[PDB]
């Protein structure tokens, strides 16, 4: 063993303070686990046809598989990570329908790129408003928040590939959307242009969200290219989070979930992975040392280069790791020394 005074002291018995292996499965207990299968969190939020089983569900940890794929209308979400983290921290997909007026337009649009049964469909939580008898009047719709809790609204804008398509769907070539509340406003203008085809569709959809406080009112003023919401999600606070892992779900008990299965949380340090959920030991770089409950955290792996923000995140996590490794080393040394001293 290692001590402050002597780097190599032989002792009769010793124990390992670093966990280096994993079970290989997620224990499914005591935390509530929701397996996403082929669905991502955003796809389950929007109402992808293959994710219809995730409606109104709740979770403590959301598991995203690398096999996940989208099978609906192509879309992109500005500030995707922020919305994903918000929904993951909320910890519920509970949905409540609201009766918006939407007078003078057609409702419940469907696309051939989104197949639910044998026919065309669309996102279950989104409403595609189009022309009615080749007319599209301006919409002035309101919805007040008379409840005691916050409301979350998900809406979208549609970007056609050509001007012909614009006219063919909205009967006019100039659309604009303004969604406002007493303390916020968001103005979005569609960008008509050609884009690479996904499932034969060159068009795209951009997703935006709005939060309404109790006593506030939501106002939507649009002239076209609007993907309306059908209701609101209840947004709360809790110990929920999201994790990317390909490990199978088992049937056991463990208060610490790692991407590589569940790990025992008896030892004070571990080196399996820096991504942890629940009551977990501290992560250190040391592979062997011889003698905390965080829930939602920051993202620690990135598949794309982004620059400043990602560099700062990496720097933060590196600093944490290095300081805790120093702490571990010093602690082990001190304890070994004091034990040697007290046994002589």
């Amino acid at each position: 063993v290692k001590t402050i005074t002597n780097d190599r002291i032989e002792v009769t018995n010793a124990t390992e303070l670093v966990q280096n292996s994993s079970i290989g499965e997620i224990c499914d207990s005591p935390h509530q686990i929701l397996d996403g299968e082929n669905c991502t969190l955003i796809d389950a939020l929007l109402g992808d046809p293959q994710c219809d089983g995730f409606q109104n569900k709740k979770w403590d940890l959301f598991v995203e598989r690398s096999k996940a794929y989208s099978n609906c209308y192509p879309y992109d979400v500005p500030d995707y990570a922020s919305l994903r983290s918000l929904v993951a921290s909320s910890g519920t997909l509970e949905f409540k329908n609201e009766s918006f007026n939407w007078t003078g337009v057609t409702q419940n649009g469907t696309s051939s790129a989104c197949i639910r049964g044998s026919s065309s469909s669309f996102f279950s939580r989104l409403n595609w408003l189009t022309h009615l008898n080749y007319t599209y009047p301006a919409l002035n719709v309101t919805m007040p928040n008379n409840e005691q809790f916050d409301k979350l609204y998900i809406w979208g804008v549609h970007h056609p590939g050509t001007d012909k398509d614009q006219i063919f769907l909205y009967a006019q070539s100039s659309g604009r959307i303004t969604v406002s509340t007493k303390r916020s406003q968001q103005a979005v203008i569609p960008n008509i242009g050609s884009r690479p085809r996904i499932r034969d569709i060159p068009s795209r959809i951009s997703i935006y969200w709005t939060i309404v406080k109790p006593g506030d009112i939501l106002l939507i003023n649009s002239t076209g290219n609007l993907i309306a919401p059908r209701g609101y999600f209840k947004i709360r606070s809790g110990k929920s989070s999201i994790m990317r892992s390909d490990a199978p779900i088992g049937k056991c008990k463990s208060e610490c979930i790692t991407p590589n299965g569940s790990i025992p949380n008896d030892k004070p340090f571990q080196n399996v992975n820096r991504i942890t959920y629940g009551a977990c030991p501290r992560y250190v770089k040391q592979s062997t040392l011889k003698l905390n409950e965080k829930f939602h955290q920051i993202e620690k792996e990135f598949s794309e280069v982004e620059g400043r923000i990602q560099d700062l995140e990496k720097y933060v996590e590196d600093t944490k790791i290095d300081l805790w490794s120093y702490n571990a080393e010093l602690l082990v040394a001190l304890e070994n020394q004091h034990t040697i001293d007290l046994t002589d």
């Epitope: 649009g109 469907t110 696309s111 051939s112 790129a113 065309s120 008898n133 080749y134 056609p160 590939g161 050509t162 001007d163 012909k164 398509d165 006219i167 063919f168 769907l169 009967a171 006019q172 070539s173 034969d200 569709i201 060159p202 068009s203």
Partner: antibody
Framework: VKKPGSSVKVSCEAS?????????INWVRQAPGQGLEWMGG????????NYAQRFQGRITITVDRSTSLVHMELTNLRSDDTAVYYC?????????????????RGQGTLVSVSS | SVLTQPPSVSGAPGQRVTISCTGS?????????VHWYQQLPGTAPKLLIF???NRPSGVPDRFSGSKSGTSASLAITGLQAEDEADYYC????????????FGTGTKVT
């Protein structure tokens, strides 16, 4: 010549130089020596087919996405159904009372019903 | 539902000739434009005018169109030999479930 009470199917190609993602296909009928009449239409990539009220129950419109075709079938034919059928593609233009115009592609198909 | 049109018109070549399409409060009168189609005998109908004044590429400027109130008018500045075809006017009817309405047709001579 089709026997009375039989079915007639007219196929059309939902592709071309001017065809886009959200272009539509409409069917037009013309009796010999008479005016033009409008039948059902469909957008191959959006919504469900529309139908004229005179033909309700007898007409069906199907979209074949593998061969990029659209077919219109008329069940329970009658002697007055002898006419020439045309495909039309929808055109777009900027206006305030805008409604799509019809672009006739190719020549019509002659269908005659007799016993 | 159909739009009223003169059965036929005639005149010598070289002068203006007018055709009219009269509508109701549901078509043309409900802020809807009118399209004009041309059909030479033994051929599929073609497109002549849309948007009440727009001419597609391949149509001479001799053809003009206008709309006023619940009526529309088609005009040809100079009659020629090739103007032997029939003309139809098309609008949209918002009544009931909505449909596309065509005129009764006209014959130019």
């Amino acid at each position: 010549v089709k026997k009375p009470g039989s079915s007639v199917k007219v196929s059309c190609e939902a592709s071309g130089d001017t065809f886009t993602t959200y272009s539509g296909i409409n069917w037009v009928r013309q009796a010999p020596g008479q005016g033009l009449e409008w039948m059902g239409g469909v957008l191959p990539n959006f919504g469900s087919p529309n139908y004229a009220q005179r033909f309700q129950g007898r007409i069906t419109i199907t979209v074949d996405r593998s061969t990029s075709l659209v077919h219109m079938e008329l069940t329970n034919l009658r002697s007055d159904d002898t006419a020439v059928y045309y495909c039309t593609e929808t055109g777009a233009y900027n206006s305030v009372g805008y409604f799509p115009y019809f672009q006739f592609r190719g020549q019509g198909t002659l269908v005659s019903v007799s016993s | 539902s159909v739009l009223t049109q003169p059965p036929s018109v005639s005149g010598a070549p070289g002068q203006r000739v007018t055709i009219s399409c009269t509508g109701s409060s549901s078509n043309i009168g409900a802020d809807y434009d009118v399209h004009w189609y041309q059909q030479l005998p033994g051929t599929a109908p073609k497109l002549l005018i849309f948007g009440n004044n727009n001419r597609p590429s391949g149509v001479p400027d001799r053809f003009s169109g206008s709309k006023s109130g619940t009526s529309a008018s088609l005009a040809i500045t100079g009659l020629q030999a090739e103007d032997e075809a029939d003309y139809y006017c098309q609008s949209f009817d918002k009544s009931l479930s909505g449909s596309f309405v065509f005129g009764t047709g006209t014959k130019v001579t």
